[PDB]
RNA sequence: UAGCUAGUAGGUGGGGUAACGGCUCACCUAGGCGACGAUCCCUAGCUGGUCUGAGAGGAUGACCAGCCACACUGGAACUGA
RNA sequence: CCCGCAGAAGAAGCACCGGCUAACUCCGUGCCAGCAGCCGCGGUAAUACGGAGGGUGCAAGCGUUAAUCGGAAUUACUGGGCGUAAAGCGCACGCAGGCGGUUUGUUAAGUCAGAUGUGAAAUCCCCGGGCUCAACCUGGGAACUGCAUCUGAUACUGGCAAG
């Protein structure tokens, strides 16, 4: 948003977790697609797509397994205010690895299991369970 | 409570001080006892409570109180206090030691008798 | 087999027209030691009318608990009413590491190896609320796999 | 000046030394420079009574480390022993 | 220091039988056992959360005749040792010398066990020792001495032995006095009823 | 070439030296946010080639006068 | 405790030192430090460690080891590696 | 250290027992004497005070005092709050400071990775070894969660450039 635009997206998806919205939109970044990418491909959301050229927005589609959303918690971790960097042996484990970690490598964004595999650590964007 | 309002001024923790002051850490502190009176305790409570007002070794002049089913101290003794409050008028925090120095174990006491000063009867 | 043991009783009063009147309530807990247990809460004028009303009153409303092995899928969180409780996995051997309602709670409900505790208030209905509400809302991966994943 | 002495460790009647290459003028187990070996004065068939890993004392001696004689003693045994 | 009170009253306490008064006579008809040990035996002894922790504490230490201090490192080190402290702490106190020696036989009580172990008359692996709380390992020989093999006492202590069931885990001779510690008994043939969870509760805090 | 600390020139008026401050981004050791820290460092350049603003190199040397130890290396940023 | 500082800050020469150096001196320049806490006041030997704590932390710095500083108080040197 | 010698022979205490807190009865006393960490107890019983008998706990110790951390999420980094419980400045504007939409490029400061050097020994921890066992001693290891340097990465933050 006016400061921490990846608070933002996250705001956007549990309240629209919590209002039992279908789709959810936001102005696009690079990194807001990274991330969107990390959860479609971690089975959190459905799908995402990002339409417009001088004003691109993300298109992120939300998923309930009945009538529950799959997301339980997504909590922003590194903040501008705290920045969070792990080492690849101090990754956190979100909910005992039931839910993962997107954090940002110097080899891309991924999720916290595929960080601690490839040995690199990085940012640690957020909790998402 | 925000993290540059806690990186400026950081948490001070609340520091709190000790209620013997006199002891000044000392476990146990000499005395003089200047007189000894019985004064009366808080409503609830009706009695006459033996205490004696004793300067310390370390000038401080505090009230001390003198348990125990019986008594021998006088307007001059030396005697050895050691910390803890009864709920008697305010300003009693001092408790004499009984058979530590001037003070005397009760007499004809059986039990608890450690904390009194008494020795065991040879039975 | 249903594991009962009774939390706590007091002595709640009512000033009625004359004088003041009197009640006892209880908190009970009931559970089988296979992930399943419940609370009941109960007001008699009487110690045990009180405890028996509390134990049909947890009897029903049992929950399911999915516990692993005799302790916790994942660290978990529970709040009610400004009381905040926190149970952790343990390894076996560890007890109940527990406070008041919560090691009652986890003991009924069949949990052996946890590590345990409450923040807030310590009001026993209260823990209670949240230990359960903690518990209900903890996640298997059986679950979670079917919700999202593989 | 550097001597490789023994540094007197273990209890009280139970001595345990430590071989240490160490500046002649700080006290005797105090501030050393280097541990090589040790020696149990009290183990008779208990095993290992001296372990002295001879190619650092070869090399502090290569450097005009003089040898006390319990330490030189120590030596003529380890080496006699092989 | 031991304990050296009188044994059954702290048998009535526990309730359950604690075999530190053994022989023939086969208590209950010794004397009085199931009321706890005092003016107010009959009273009802039902006792708080804390109470039934402290209870089988104090049983298993009555078993062994192990004081606090000691039962505390017991305590500490099994919690130290990798696997669950309960057993890990039964096992530290069927370990000990004075048990063992008790329990293959020679040596009618623990406390007869015990006055034979610091009484200078068994050998672990061919060598004195009189210490009670003495670990024993798996495989040492725990056998009386030859000076005190013609001791009447340890004799009769064999015969009331196979009469109390012979432990698995150790196996001994009666012809020559002798045993061996064949490996660490696991919670399994330690045969009692005790709740070593409620001691790692008592402890944990 | 040993350290070359890269810093900034904050003062020209002793002759022959300058005053050069070195920014560095440390994370707080118990709040866990990354601070900004200044190390204002008297250096020494012997044709007064720096102006305020400069973005200057530094190495360290043996010391030239009381508090001066660093000289100057280059001015990457001639800022003016 | 909000300003502090005239070998004060720097520079050239002498000198001095085992050695660099305002270390010292003569001249020159007029700086330097400070709100990222100067200055001033108060307290305090420092560390490995210790205790406590799930931890993060708190509290400590007896013994042992390492470093500092002191030797009635204040000055000063000599001798000497 | 081993051996012999008699002989149970030379060798138990201290706290507590209303609730918290394991363990209760009788006498005495009568808001006195006293107790007390808190709640509180004592005006004819009073399982709470003194004695007893009994019991509980610990044991060559046991209690008390002091003191530190804990419990205390009761300064909350982890880990708290500010409508009414304590707490939004009477209100703005605003410098320092903190924070900063989006896309390229670059750099590589943060960050991450690897390496290397250092992180004394002792201590702590693991596996052993010696003391009859233990304490204690000791071997090897791990740890020292740090600091620096070099090589690399470039998502993110910073820089620089261009939008």
């Known amino acids: ?129 | 409570a925000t993290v540059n309002q806690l990186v400026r001024k950081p948490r001070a923790r609340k520091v709190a001080k000790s209620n013997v002051p006199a002891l000044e850490a000392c476990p146990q502190k000499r005395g003089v006892c200047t007189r000894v009176y019985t004064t009366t305790p808080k409503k609830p409570n009706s009695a006459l409570r033996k205490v004696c007002r004793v300067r310390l070794t370390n000038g401080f002049e505090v009230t001390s109180y003198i348990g125990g089913e019986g008594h021998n101290l006088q307007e001059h003794s030396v005697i050895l206090i050691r910390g803890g409050r009864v709920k008697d008028l305010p300003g009693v925090r001092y408790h004499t030691v009984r058979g530590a120095l001037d003070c005397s174990g009760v007499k004809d006491r059986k039990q608890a008798r450690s904390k009194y000063g008494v020795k065991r009867p040879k039975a | 087999e249903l594991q009962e043991k009774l939390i706590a009783v007091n002595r709640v009063s009512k000033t009625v027209k004359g004088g003041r009147i009197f009640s006892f309530t209880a908190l009970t807990v009931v559970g089988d030691g296979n992930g399943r247990v419940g609370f009941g809460y109960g007001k008699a004028r009487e110690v045990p009318a009180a405890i028996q009303k509390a134990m049909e009153k947890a009897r029903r409303n049992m929950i399911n608990v999915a516990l692993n092995n005799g302790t916790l899928q994942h660290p978990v969180k529970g709040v009610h009413t400004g009381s905040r409780v926190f149970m952790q996995p343990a390894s076996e051997g560890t007890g109940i590491i527990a406070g008041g309602a919560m090691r009652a709670v986890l003991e009924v409900a069949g949990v052996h190896n946890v590590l345990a505790k409450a923040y807030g208030s310590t009001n026993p209905i209260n823990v209670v609320r949240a230990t359960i509400d903690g518990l209900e809302n903890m996640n298997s991966p059986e679950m979670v796999a079917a919700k999202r994943g593989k | 000046m550097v001597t490789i002495r023994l540094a007197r460790h273990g209890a009280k009647k139970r001595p345990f030394y430590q071989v240490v290459v160490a500046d002649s003028r700080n006290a005797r187990n105090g501030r050393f420079i280097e541990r090589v070996g040790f020696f149990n004065p009290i183990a008779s068939e208990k095993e290992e009574g001296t372990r002295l890993d001879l190619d650092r004392i070869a090399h502090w001696v290569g450097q005009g480390a003089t040898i006390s004689d319990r330490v030189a003693a120590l030596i003529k045994e380890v080496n006699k022993a092989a | 220091a031991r304990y050296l009170g009188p044994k059954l009253k702290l048998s009535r306490r526990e309730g359950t039988d604690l075999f530190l008064k053994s022989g023939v006579r086969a208590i209950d008809t010794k004397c009085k056992i199931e009321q706890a040990p005092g003016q107010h035996g009959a009273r009802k002894p039902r006792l708080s959360d804390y109470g039934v922790q402290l209870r089988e504490k104090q049983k298993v230490r009555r078993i062994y005749g192990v004081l606090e201090r000691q039962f505390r490192n017991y305590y500490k080190e099994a919690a130290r040792l990798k696997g669950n402290t309960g057993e890990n702490l039964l096992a530290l106190l069927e370990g000990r010398l004075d048990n063992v020696v008790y329990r293959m036989g020679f040596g009618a009580t623990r406390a007869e066990a015990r006055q034979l172990v610091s009484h200078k008359a068994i050998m672990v692996n061919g060598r004195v020792v009189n210490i009670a709380s003495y670990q024993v390992s798996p495989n040492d020989v725990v056998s009386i001495r030859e000076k005190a093999k013609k001791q009447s006492r340890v004799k009769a202590a064999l015969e009331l032995a196979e009469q109390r069931e012979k432990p698995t885990w150790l196996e001994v001779d009666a012809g020559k006095m002798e045993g061996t510690f064949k490996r660490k008994p696991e919670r399994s043939d330690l045969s009692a009823d005790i709740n070593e969870h409620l001691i790692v509760e008592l402890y944990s805090k | 070439k040993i350290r070359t600390l890269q810093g900034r020139v904050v003062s020209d008026k002793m002759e022959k030296s300058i005053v050069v401050a070195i920014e560095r981004f440390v994370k707080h050791p118990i709040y866990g946010k990354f601070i900004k820290r200044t190390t204002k460092l008297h250096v020494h350049d012997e044709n007064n080639e720096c102006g305020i603003g400069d973005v200057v190199e530094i190495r360290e040397c043996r010391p030239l006068s009381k508090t001066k130890s660093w000289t100057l290396v280059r001015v990457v940023e001639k800022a003016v």
């Open chain 1, 1 to 129: 948003s006016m400061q921490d635009p990846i608070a933002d997206m996250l705001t956007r998806i549990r309240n629209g977790q919590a209002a039992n919205k279908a789709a959810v939109t936001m102005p696009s970044s690079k990194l807001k697609v990274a991330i969107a990418n990390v959860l479609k491909e971690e089975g959190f959301i459905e799908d995402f797509k990002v339409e417009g050229d001088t004003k691109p927005e993300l298109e992120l589609t939300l998923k309930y397994f009945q009538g529950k959303a799959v997301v339980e918690s997504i909590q922003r971790v590194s903040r501008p205010g705290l920045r969070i960097y792990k080492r690849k042996d101090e990754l956190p484990k979100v909910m005992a690895g039931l839910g993962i970690a997107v954090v940002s490598t110097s080899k891309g964004v991924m999720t916290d299991r595929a960080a601690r595999q490839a040995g690199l650590g990085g940012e640690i964007i957020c909790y998402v369970a």
